[PDB]
Each structure stands twice: as C-alpha cells, then as structure tokens.
From Swiss-Prot:
InterPro entries assigned to the protein according to its UniProt record, in alphabetical order: ATP-guanido_PTrfase (IPR000749), ATP-guanido_PTrfase_AS (IPR022415), ATP-guanido_PTrfase_cat (IPR022414), ATP-guanido_PTrfase_N (IPR022413), ATP-guanido_PTrfase_N_sf (IPR036802), Gln_synth/guanido_kin_cat_dom (IPR014746)
Main localisation: cytoplasm
Record domain Phosphagen kinase N-terminal: where: 8-90
Family: Belongs to the ATP:guanido phosphotransferase family.
Protein name: Arginine kinase
Outcome after substituting residue 313 to D: Reduces catalytic activity by 98.3%
Binding site for substrate: 63-67, 224, 270, 313
Lineage, opening ranks: Eukaryota, Metazoa, Ecdysozoa, Arthropoda, Chelicerata
Outcome of substituting residue 270 to A/D/N/S: Decreases affinity for phosphoarginine and ADP and reduces catalytic activity by 99%
Subunit structure and binding partners: Monomer.
GO function term, MF aspect, one: arginine kinase activity
Location of the Phosphagen kinase C-terminal domain: 118-355
UniProt binding sites for ATP: 121-125, 184, 228, 279-283, 308-313
C-alpha cells in the first residue's frame, strides 16, 4: 500500500473518530487495533482498506459503511468484516459457517393480509455473483458488457411464466426508466453510497433489467450485485412469490456458475447481502402503529425486521407506506429468512388491529 492511500486512511479514520454522532457499524467496529492490524494489507487485485471503508468515511450517515471490492477482501480484512458481519446478521461467530442453500416447505408459507387492508405488495429477492468476475470496484468497462451478455443470453432461454425481454439501460428512454423506477421495478440511479464505493464506473454500460411482461419476475443486471433475481406482485401472496423466485433461481443456477463461499454462502458486494442474499418484503400500511416511525422501527427490530421508505432504502415513507423486510440474511436458511419476514408481518398486523 502506497503512502497516499495510507494518508487518506489515517485521515478517514480520524474523520470517523470526529463524528460524535455517527452510528454506522464502520465507526462502531473500526478500532485502532482493527485498523493498524489491516490498513497495510492489500489483495491480489490491489484492493485496499480505503477501497473498503471509503463509502463509510464520505457517507458518515451510512448504517454499515463498508463493501468488499472482491471475495478476497472478505478474509484479508476479516478483522473488520468479521465483527461487522456478526453485528448486522444478529450473531455469526468466527467459527460459524453458513448452512447449505435450503428453500424449505414452500407449502408452509401463508397469505400475509387476507382482507387486504394493509399490505400493498409483496417482494422477495436474492443476489448472485458470476464466478470469475470480481465485484464492481475491480471491474472494467469491457467486463460489464461481458457479464451483461452472459446473463441476458441465459435469461433468453427462460420459458413459461419466466419468459421475457432484456432491456439494456444503455439507450433506454428517460421516460421508460423513470417509470420502471417509479413502479418499484428498476433499481434507482446514482446512489451516493454505491458511488463513493466505486460501484458505478462506466455507468450505465452493462447495466440493465430483464422481466416477464407481467413484470412479476425480474433480474437486475450490474447494479449493486452482478445479479438480483426478483419476484414481486401486488397483494400479500407470499407463497406464490417465493415459489416463483425459487423456480427462477434454481433454473438460473443450472445455467450460470455462481460464487459460493463455504463460510459466507453466496457471495455479494455488501456484507449485508451475504448468505441467502435474501430480502423478503412488503409495502405495508400501519396507520396506528406507524403513527411514529420510532416505535414502529422498535417493534420491527424485535422481530428482526427492517423498515425502509417506499422508494427503497435511504428514502422516506410516501403516504404511510413503508418497506418492512427481514434484516438478517446470513446464518439462517432461505426458509428461515422468508420466515422471519412472514412471522414479523403477521404479528405486526395483529398489533395494528389491537392499537387504539
Ligand atoms: N414490497 C415491495 N413492493 C414493491 N417494491 C418494493 C418492495 N420491496 C422492495 N421494493 C423496491 O425495491 C427497490 C430497490 O429498493 P432497495 O431498498 O434498494 O432494495 P433491494 O436492493 O434489496 O432490492 C425499490 O424500488 C423499492 O421500492
Ligand atoms: N444495499 C445495501 N447494501 N444496503 C445496506 C448498506 C447501504 C449503505 N452502505 C449504508 O451503510
Ligand atoms: Mg439496493
């Protein structure tokens, strides 16, 4: 590691230390011991601690603050990643390994809000990384195009309910784009956290979205992760959604080689999406419970659930419509994941009905 980098590090580190009110895990876990113990390290791909904690430093309002420029970054900086992974995922010790992929008894999932007086839509998604391809930061424009090609081609062979068209971002009308985003279908553009993390170079080359006409099955190409296989729909039928997602992932897993770590499961760019890479969610209304986002989030936390704004993370709720999803992703099976979201949302419903 050269001096410059080391300078910005000592600098950044000092910055964090001076943010009396910063509540990101980065701050909470980057101690001087941890710092000095790795700051000099570098990976086979010259990825350095600056390339890991940078977004955290520049975006103090971060919750997590770090990223893995590449698989190696996960062990090379273990001293840091380790406690963070453990903190975020609700306990994942050093000796702890991640359980084998397991969808579970799809038939044990239920409709979340029968009367339909709270839940607007149910989304469930996963993330995958193409073997032989590092994460965003270490990518080359030529590589974004390569990955785009492999994915779209594979997806071209999707049949039945999963059959669809791949729409590159490059050449997409602002209108079409803005709409797809407004309908919660396509990823947002210009995320500050992803930018300072250097995960948007050569944008929008290689970026895109594949989806069945119904738009109930989609696949994000080259945003935060190489792939984001999604299944969503209006209503609260988790069963259908999950079942659809499963049919999708497995099918795709049979055609593309995905990165899977024995200790972290399927690997992702952000430490928060490792393991099952699963985030089950619903856009739900809870007038009485949400009378204050504080107590609402406090409730959510008791169920290992996370509260986001209507347009995604780092947004505000639009019309008392919040994004409640399962927080933890690593350290439990796919089934346990969708399960934490299902259980939490059923009780929250009950609690809402019992509120004055
Ligand atoms: N239950 C849901 N229904 C509709 N859209 C949702 C729902 N859950 C998540 N989303 C959408 O996912 C998109 C990306 O949001 P984000 O919070 O970054 O989640 P992720 O990257 O995990 O998919 C946003 O457009 C958000 O509104
Ligand atoms: N898409 C995500 N990884 N979201 C969680 C982390 C986002 C941002 N780096 C904070 O901290
Ligand atoms: Mg996101």
């Amino acid at each position: 590691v050269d001096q410059a980098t080391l300078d910005k590090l000592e600098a950044g580190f000092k910055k964090l230390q001076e943010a009396s009110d910063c509540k990101s895990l980065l701050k909470k876990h980057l101690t001087k011991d941890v710092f000095d113990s790795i700051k000099n390290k570098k990976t086979g791909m010259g990825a350095t601690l600056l390339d890991v904690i940078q977004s955290g430093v520049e975006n103090l309002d971060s919750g997590v603050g770090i990223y893995a420029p590449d698989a190696e970054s996960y062990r090379t900086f273990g001293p840091l990643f380790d406690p963070i992974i453990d903190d975020y995922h609700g306990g994942f010790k050093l000796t702890d390994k991640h359980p084998p992929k397991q969808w579970g008894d799809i038939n044990t999932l239920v409709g979340l809000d029968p009367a339909g007086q709270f839940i607007i839509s149910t989304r469930v998604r996963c993330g995958r990384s193409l073997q032989g391809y590092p994460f965003n930061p270490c990518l080359t424009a030529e590589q974004y195009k390569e990955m785009e090609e492999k994915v779209s081609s594979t997806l071209s062979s999707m049949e039945d309910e999963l059959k669809g068209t791949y729409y590159p971002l490059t050449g997409m009308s602002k209108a079409t784009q803005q709409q797809l985003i407004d309908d919660h279908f396509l990823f947002k553009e210009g995320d500050r956290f992803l930018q300072t993390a250097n995960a948007c170079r050569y944008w929008p080359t290689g970026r895109g979205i594949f989806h069945n006409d119904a738009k109930t099955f989609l696949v994000w190409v080259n945003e935060q992760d190489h792939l984001r296989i999604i299944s969503m729909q209006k209503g609260g039928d988790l069963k259908t959604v999950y079942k659809r997602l499963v049919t999708a992932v497995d099918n795709i897993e049979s055609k593309l080689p995905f990165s899977h770590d024995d200790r972290f499961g399927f690997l992702t760019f952000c430490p928060t999406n490792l393991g099952t890479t699963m985030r089950a969610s619903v856009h739900i209304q809870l007038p009485k419970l949400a009378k204050d986002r504080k107590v609402l989030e406090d409730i959510a936390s008791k169920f290992n659930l996370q509260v986001r704004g209507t347009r995604g993370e780092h947004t505000e709720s639009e019309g008392g419509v919040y994004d409640i999803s399962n927080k933890r992703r690593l350290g439990l099976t796919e089934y346990q994941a969708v399960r934490e979201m299902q259980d939490g949302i059923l009780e929250m419903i009950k609690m809402e009905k019992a509120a004055a």
